[PDB]
Design a protein around this nucleic acid. Structure first.
Lengths: 52, 50, 139, 129, 134, 117
RNA sequence: AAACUUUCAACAACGGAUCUCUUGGUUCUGGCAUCGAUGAAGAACGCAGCGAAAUGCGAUAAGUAAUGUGAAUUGCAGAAUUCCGUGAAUCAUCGAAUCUUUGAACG
RNA sequence: GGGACCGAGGACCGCGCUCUGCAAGGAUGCUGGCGUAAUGGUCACCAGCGACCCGUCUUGAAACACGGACCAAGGAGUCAAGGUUUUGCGCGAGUGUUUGGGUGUAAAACCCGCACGCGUAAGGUGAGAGCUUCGGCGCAUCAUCGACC
RNA sequence: GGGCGAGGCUCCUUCUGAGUUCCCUGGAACGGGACGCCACAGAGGGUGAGAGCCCCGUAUAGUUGGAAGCCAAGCCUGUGUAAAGCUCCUUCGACGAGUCGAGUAGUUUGGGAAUGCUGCUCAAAAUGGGAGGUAAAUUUCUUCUAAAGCUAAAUACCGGCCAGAGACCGAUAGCGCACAAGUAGAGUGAUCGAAAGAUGAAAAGCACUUUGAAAAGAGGGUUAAAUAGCACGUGAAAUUGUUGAAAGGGAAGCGCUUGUGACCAGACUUGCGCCCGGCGGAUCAUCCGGUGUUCUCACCGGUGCACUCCGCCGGGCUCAGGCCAG
């Protein structure tokens, strides 16, 4: 473990990459208070009755 | 920084304390792994020819 | 962080060691899969909170994932064996899935799996004798 | 386009998030962000610190510049101002200079958290030609 | 796993060597194990079979049956054990080809050369046992 | 550009690791033979010729006679104690002369000599 | 109705596909440098108890000497080996020899 | 009043009415025989109806012409170098370790010095996506007048 | 300066781990199950089927003897006014000719300052000669010594003595040749040049009887198998014979739809739930302790004592159940 940290510091021309997303938990991301608070009212249900 | 426990020869924790070396937080990219593995698995072959 | 159930499903929806794929459907051998069907709903090893029911010698052994122990597989599964009454097992299993908000969407599947395992443990009826027809019968 | 051409699982997660946002919000900001996530690399040219600095030289300071692209460093700038930048990916020098100037690096999922409707966001594109 | 570059893991070459080996190599190949009593008597596991040895057949259709070796027929890698024969159509008995790996030696034909072979094998085994022990 | 027979004149480097191993084994053969001695000779510092590369120095062939004399190392002894000698090169400048005599003084300070037999 | 022509099936024929195998080929890599007038490469004729080819050998001819191993060869026939031994073997190694006619070929 | 064909969907939601209910966002109820080759299916033959021998080539199209005794196996847009378009990936004013060197569990994997290849060292008017404190800000890019080399 | 030289390195050789324990199938375990062992050795191969522990080998350290090269601790000697390096200087300093070069012809090169080479004619110099730099004011400057010779290494390699490998090919493939293949054979000759692998674990390759002139056939026998008989693993199609069923007035074959005959896959064999009685048992509710957990849900142990639970039986009823129909 010690030398793993050491060698990844010692690699030249390479740094540990930065991900394009910060939180990978889309459940928290979506069901967070901000999204749901600014969110619009649902326009329907998952399974919708057929009228005619 | 999170912590991992060290285990002795008997399988029981020793009480030692170790920190993740910051590389286990790197992004997981199966496509990049696929590309690199494909090339690096061809990199061993011996030539054949009639 | 970098990892989540969504990331794991992204990595593993196309291939698993538990994945068996045929022409009539795709199944999963995972012990935490209540219907043995490949889906994010039922991918127990993917989801943080998951349930699994396995047969016992007389009854059902129910395993559930501990969210504070994902890093520790040897101590990551709350195991309870229900070897009393069929109705009592169903009660307890449905509580473990729906009372405190750990997988109420899997409540029905868990109860059905427990019922199926108990019916399997039930003694089995002898076969009806085979009746021949036509040329085979006259032969 | 229904499925992105990329094989990146994290870009797929961002696509799902912003698809949900575009469907459940009245935000043309979210719609354009989803469209720019669907477009390919050659159609997402890099945006430079110089271009962002001169797009904030006017009264647009104290804002969140969102660019669905990679932000590159420009050696021609002796000074970098404070700025709220969000983008898909940064260069190491762009991160270093922004953080030394006093701004903060932001990702698109974060921008979805703080600013889910695109308020006080300057949406920028790079030079196509 | 092999380490020395001289040895080869080639199936083709191994089978070629086995099936084109000369008579001395065939003798070494047709070495056979010793019984337990001989094992703790001589500190030797296996020895090449020879004509005067008494063996016990413990594999094949002949379950557990003993007899003196009649001939070591090195050409097809078989030995002939006394009284282990089958009758042809004419009623003449022909010996059955049995393999030294399928036989076990019970009584050993003794001379100076085989005493020397046993002494060398025992010396190597005891030297290595002593080296491992202390 | 294949108007000729490149097929009969084409070469592949499938033995690149084999030649690397062979060269490494040759360097160990030299150091097995010249065991306490370095596996090379001390080479001088020389300025590159043209205007394009005259801002840099490299290693040359051998040391000049008068810079060996200034360092205090005799001519007939230098190749014996492991110093390359180049009788063709002229210093033409106190700068090169001083750089090479300093290099030879460093070699002298770091050298160990064994007394003949 | 039979015969004949044709369709399908069962079994049996012809033929050698498929599957399986492989003491072979092909390609790459590594260590080393060794033909001949002291008669080469090649060609020919002989030699085994019973052999035509292949293989080995050269009138000392499926071979001799020496060294090592240690009890065979094998299709048959006949001898062995005393096994408490300078010693079987179509054995291995190989430093000594034998080595027909030619062929650079040389009365 | 008589006949034919059909019954898609699968808790409730709706529009309605003749409203204790209903023919109103898709079939229910009652009954009989059989429960096995009975329905169903596959083969062979008969029967009624239909129905040019395939491919190539030429032409506006035919016709001609060419190949076709049958079967098994083989069989034809591949590889390399140099360009170029697009898509994915990494780094990004930089990028490229694998000429070579250093390790190695040894043709793998891992690491790297100096070079080298390619590339890099200022507006106004009107639109404009997207934001707005709804006073206006204004990406990319475009048309014109510009500024400089 | 010489001569011995123990010893060492390289390479061949000797020797070095552990189950044939028990049961089942099988002709034969190397297969399945049980219980063990070795492992710096679970590469590979053989053995009657997939063997780390039956055998050869395989890993590391040693160990037995031998071969030739090189190094070499030490020990004997050394000798001659012998050789060598450097320094200084009122002394010297020899450097390659039918070769350079000039003209010319051919050839060659990216290269008429001829890029090199060769042939013919002429044929040199000594502060000399050759090649470059340069408008810089004259051919200044720079850099080397040709016409004599030797020399390891890094370099190439379809051949020689071997060795190790492969995302190669697998008997119409792979070299033409996996085989008595550069063979049989063809051509006057130079040359051209094939086809052809597999019984079986083991020949155990069929004794004996009978028919036949014989080849062979039929009994019989070996084998796990002759549905493996040296026309031999498996054994397709084209084509053919026999038997079974069928069709057929100058083509057959093909599509749609019945019908006859033959031959078949499904589906069903009852499931669920209530009312009784007989039972027979063990995990009725609640409470107490411990543990676990999603901190409110469970699990054990006690309590329960059998109008509560759990299974069976002898009955009754409901609903749902296959095909074809009214």
């Amino acid at each position: 473990i010690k030398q793993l940290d050491a060698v990844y510091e010692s690699k030249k021309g390479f740094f540990l990459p930065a991900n394009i997303v910060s939180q990978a938990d889309l459940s928290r991301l979506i069901n967070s208070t901000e999204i749901q608070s600014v969110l619009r009212a649902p326009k329907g249900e998952a399974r919708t009755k057929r009228a005619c | 920084r999170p912590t991992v426990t060290v285990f002795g020869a008997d399988g029981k924790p020793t009480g030692a304390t170790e920190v993740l070396p910051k590389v286990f937080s790197a992004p997981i990219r199966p496509d990049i792994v696929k590309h690199v593995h494909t090339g690096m698995a061809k990199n061993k072959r011996q030539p054949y020819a009639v | 962080s970098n990892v989540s159930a969504d990331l794991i499903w992204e990595v593993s929806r196309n291939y698993n060691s538990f994945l068996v794929k045929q022409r009539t459907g795709t199944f999963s051998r995972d012990a935490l899969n209540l219907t043995n069907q490949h889906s994010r709903k039922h991918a127990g090893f993917v989801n943080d909170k998951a349930l699994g029911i396995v047969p016992a010698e007389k009854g059902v052994k129910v395993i559930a994932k501990k969210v504070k122990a994902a890093n520790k597989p040897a101590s990551s599964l709350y195991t309870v064996t229900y070897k009393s009454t069929a109705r009592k097992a169903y009660k307890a299993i449905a509580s473990q899935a729906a009372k405190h908000g750990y997988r109420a969407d899997l409540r029905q599947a868990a109860v059905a799996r427990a019922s199926a395992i108990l019916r399997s443990q039930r003694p089995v009826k002898p076969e009806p004798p085979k009746k021949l027809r036509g040329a085979a019968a006259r032969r | 386009r229904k499925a992105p051409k990329s094989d990146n699982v994290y870009l797929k997660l961002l696509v799902k998030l912003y698809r949900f946002l575009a469907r459940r919000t009245e935000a043309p900001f979210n719609k354009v962000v989803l469209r720019r996530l669907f477009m390919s690399r050659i159609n997402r040219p890099p945006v430079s610190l110089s271009r962002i600095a001169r797009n904030l030289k006017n009264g647009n300071e104290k804002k969140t510049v969102v660019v669905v692209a990679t932000v590159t460093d420009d050696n021609r700038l002796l000074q970098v101002p404070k700025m709220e930048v969000a983008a898909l990916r940064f260069t190491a020098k762009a991160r270093a200079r922004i953080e030394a100037a006093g701004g903060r690096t932001l990702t698109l999922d974060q921008l979805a958290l703080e600013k889910p409707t695109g308020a006080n966001t300057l949406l920028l594109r790079g030079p196509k030609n | 796993m092999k380490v020395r570059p001289t040895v080869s893991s080639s199936r083709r070459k191994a089978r070629k060597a086995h099936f084109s080996a000369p008579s001395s190599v065939r003798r070494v190949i047709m070495s056979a194990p010793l019984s337990k009593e001989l094992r703790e008597k001589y500190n030797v596991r296996s020895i090449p079979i020879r004509k005067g040895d008494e063996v016990q057949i413990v594999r094949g259709a002949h379950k557990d049956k003993e007899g003196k070796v009649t001939s070591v027929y090195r050409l097809k890698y078989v030995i002939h054990v006394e009284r282990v024969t089958r009758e042809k159509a004419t009623g003449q008995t022909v010996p059955i080809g049995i393999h030294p790996s399928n036989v076990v030696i019970t009584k050993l034909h003794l001379d100076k050369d085989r005493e020397n072979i046993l002494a060398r094998i025992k010396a190597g085994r005891e030297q290595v046992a002593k080296a491992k022990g202390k | 550009h294949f108007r000729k027979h490149w097929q009969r004149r084409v070469r592949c480097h499938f033995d690149q690791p084999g030649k690397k191993v062979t060269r490494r084994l040759a360097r160990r053969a030299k150091a097995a033979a010249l065991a306490p001695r370095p596996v090379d000779k001390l080479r001088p510092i020389v300025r590159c010729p043209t205007v394009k590369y005259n801002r840099r120095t490299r290693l040359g062939r051998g040391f000049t006679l008068e810079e060996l004399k200034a360092a205090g190392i005799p001519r007939l002894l230098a190749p014996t104690i492991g110093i390359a000698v180049d009788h063709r090169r002229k210093n033409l400048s106190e700068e090169s002369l001083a750089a090479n005599v300093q290099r030879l003084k460093d070699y002298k300070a770091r050298l160990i000599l064994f007394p003949r037999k």
